[PDB]
Ligand binder design. Structure first.
Ligand code: HEM
Ligand code: DEB
Length: 403
């Protein structure tokens, strides 16, 4: 009877209990969000099927007779701005998707990511060197945020003097508040103008960075990245390239800090960090929901999703489905996390997984290694969770360097 409003506090306050209640009733239920009807998928089997069903399109640019396609994530976005944000792998369906992903896969490799390991370690050490030996500091502004932003900038050839503004615009983009739709759309245009210039500079002065490489990437069959494709891929790589890791590092720091046994365990055993990263992602997936558009009627979990429906796959909620992950509310750094959906599922499976695990592992290892008595600077229940279903995270986290 009562259709859930994804804007309500129920989805930002102890929201996993809310997901649990829904999943129990119907793993595929109708919901309201940003003034339109949608379907929320909270069951694991259902979410995995949904992401595996190509009839559920990822392309917001496709047009359908009498329909006005509206992806929640592009709230306040002019059409040209949307196109700049949506002409990449994550916003494409095969065959376009296939060639774009393959072309980008030729340069965004494990080798290139591993080559960065030394940089990630040095950047991590320099940031930690600067916070001191004691007292309180905001681990986000001083570590979780600056590390990923510097790494992605180095990967995409973004000179130092051009790194002080986009962080602000990206932040605004993560929140989908109807009240600030205009400010959100304007932050998006700034990002677009920033990318257009970056591409211009890189075309004019090539380097050994990923963007320079993508500008040259080609293949007999796949062809190459068109100007629009190159610009849009660069844009997403920039944002998705750091915001996710910022969430991972912040949430991971908070989780380990608020779970004595898990904290104590990690401090005693190092080789437990890698799986901890996986469990941190399973427990509180940054990309809580991922959007899809039903190009045809699609039945998921026995529910007929009508054609033209907006579908929100609750990746995060799927990771807490007790049917897939027993005692889903227990943060256990030793649990077998195989199968979680925090990196997606299917053809759109995260392309940056290698880099994310590298950053998370290097960051958490260094932080908890450098400060053995690190502790939260506030009560666990007082942490402020970013109000976003697009990318969950923590934007301010006080910590006591010496306990
Ligand atoms: C912990 C960090 C990360 C998480 C949790 C994460 C998660 C995800 C998820 C859920 C998807 C699937 C989206 C969908 O199904 O529509 C995805 C796709 C993707 N991710 Fe990540 N990601 C992370 C880091 C990265 C990084 C560091 C980069 C860039 C350097 C990146 C680039 C991409 C790209 C380009 C895709 C598009 C895949 C495609 O459509 O073929 N990711 N990511
Ligand atoms: C504002 C809308 C966009 O969001 C962002 O770029 C966010 C900053 C990123 O954190 C998102 C959440 C990523 O981490 C991945 C899950 C998906 C990504 C790779 C896509 O391709 C996807 C089309 C995406 O660009 C849009 C949803």
């Amino acid at each position: 009877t009562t259709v859930p409003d994804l804007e309500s506090d129920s989805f930002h306050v102890d929201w996993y209990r809310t997901y649990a209640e829904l999943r129990e009733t119907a793993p595929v239920t109708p919901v309201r969000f940003l003034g339109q009807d949608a379907w929320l998928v909270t069951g694991y089997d259902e979410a995995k099927a949904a992401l595996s069903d190509l009839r559920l399109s990822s392309d917001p640019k496709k047009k359908y007779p009498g329909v006005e396609v509206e992806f929640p994530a592009y709230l306040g976005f002019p059409e040209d701005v949307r196109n700049y944000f949506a002409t990449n792998m994550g916003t494409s369906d095969p065959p376009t998707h296939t060639r774009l992903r393959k072309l980008v896969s030729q340069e965004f490799t494990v080798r290139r990511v591993e080559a960065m390991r030394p940089r990630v370690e040095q950047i991590t050490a320099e940031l930690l060197d600067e916070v001191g030996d004691s007292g309180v500091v905001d681990i986000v502004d001083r570590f979780a945020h600056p590390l990923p932003i510097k790494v992605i900038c180095e990967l995409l050839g973004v000179d130092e003097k051009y790194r002080g503004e986009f962080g602000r615009w990206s932040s605004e983009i993560l929140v989908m508040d109807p009240e600030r739709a205009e400010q959100r759309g304007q932050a998006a245009r700034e990002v677009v103008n920033f990318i257009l210039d970056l591409v211009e500079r890189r075309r004019t002065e090539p380097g050994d960075d990923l963007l320079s490489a993508l500008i040259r990437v080609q293949d007999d069959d796949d062809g190459r990245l068109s100007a629009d494709e190159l610009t849009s891929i660069a844009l997403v790589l920039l944002l998705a390239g750091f915001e996710t890791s910022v969430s991972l590092i912040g949430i991971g720091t908070y989780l380990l800090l608020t779970h004595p046994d898990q904290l104590a365990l990690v401090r005693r055993d190092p080789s437990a960090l890698p799986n901890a990263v996986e469990e941190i992602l399973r427990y509180i997936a940054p990309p809580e929901t991922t959007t899809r558009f039903a190009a045809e009627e699609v039945e998921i979990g026995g529910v007929a999703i009508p054609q033209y429906s907006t579908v929100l796959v609750a990746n995060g909620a799927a990771n807490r489905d007790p049917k897939q992950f027993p005692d889903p509310h227990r943060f256990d750094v030793t649990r077998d996390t195989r199968g979680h959906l925090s990196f997606g599922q299917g053809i759109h499976f995260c392309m940056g997984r290698p880099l994310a695990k590298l950053e998370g592992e290097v960051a958490l290892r260094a932080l908890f290694g450098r400060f053995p008595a690190l502790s939260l600077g506030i009560d666990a229940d007082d942490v402020v969770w970013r109000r976003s279903l697009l990318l969950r995270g923590i934007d301010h986290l006080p910590v006591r360097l010496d306990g």
